[PDB]
Amino acid sequence: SGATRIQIALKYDEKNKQFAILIIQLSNLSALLQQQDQKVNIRVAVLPCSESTTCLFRTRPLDASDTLVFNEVFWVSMSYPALHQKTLRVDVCTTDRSHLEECLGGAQISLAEVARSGERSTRWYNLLS
Numbered sequence: 592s593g594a595t596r597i598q599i600a601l602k603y604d605e606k607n608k609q610f611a612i613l614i615i616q617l618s619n620l621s622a623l624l625q626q627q628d629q630k631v632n633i634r635v636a637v638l639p640c641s642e643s644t645t646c647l648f649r650t651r652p653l654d655a656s657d658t659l660v661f662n663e664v665f666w667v668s669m670s671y672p673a674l675h676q677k678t679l680r681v682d683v684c685t686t687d688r689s690h691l692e693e694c695l696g697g698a699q700i701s702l703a704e705v706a707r708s709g710e711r712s713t714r715w716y717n718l719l720s
């Protein structure tokens with residue numbers, strides 16, 4: 592069917608020493624799902640997980656569609672040097688009233704070349720299962 596993709600923007604805010612993760616959307620979600628009508632969220636993790644601050648985030652759940660826009664932004668407190676040791680992991684999970692995640696695939700993103708100035712990179716990432 593193809594690759595399932597997610598669009599993410601990233602931006603460091605050195606004024607406040609925080610890192611923004613913007614989860615924009617999925618395309619070709621049909622490929623990743625066998626079932627129909629499931630509810631889909633994204634699980635974002637900033638790794639390795641430093642216990643000082645919060646490293647695990649979750650989007651709201653939405654009704655699955657081949658394209659699916661979330662536009663959810665998460666802010667993370669972190670010095671730029673800290674940020675540059677981190678890998679970002681985003682997974683596409685299906686979920687039900689059980690509140691159990693079924694993360695069927697996702698991407699990993701080395702954060703060693705996030706810019707410091709402020710221009711936000713927006714890129715597409717292939718999912719892997």
Ligand SMILES: CCCC(=O)OC[C@H](COP(=O)(O)O[C@@H]1[C@H](O)[C@H](O)[C@@H](OP(=O)(O)O)[C@H](OP(=O)(O)O)[C@H]1O)OC(=O)CCC
Pocket residue numbers: 600601602611612613662663664711
């Ligand atoms: C209400 C929901 C919106 C939302 O959630 O958004 C989260 C906010 C605001 O994001 P945005 O402003 O919507 O982004 C704009 C559109 O996506 C558009 O695609 C593009 O125009 P084009 O490419 O079609 O021309 C614009 O480019 P310009 O040309 O203006 O530079 C771009 O700026 O960002 C953050 O949260 C920061 C976190 C890192």
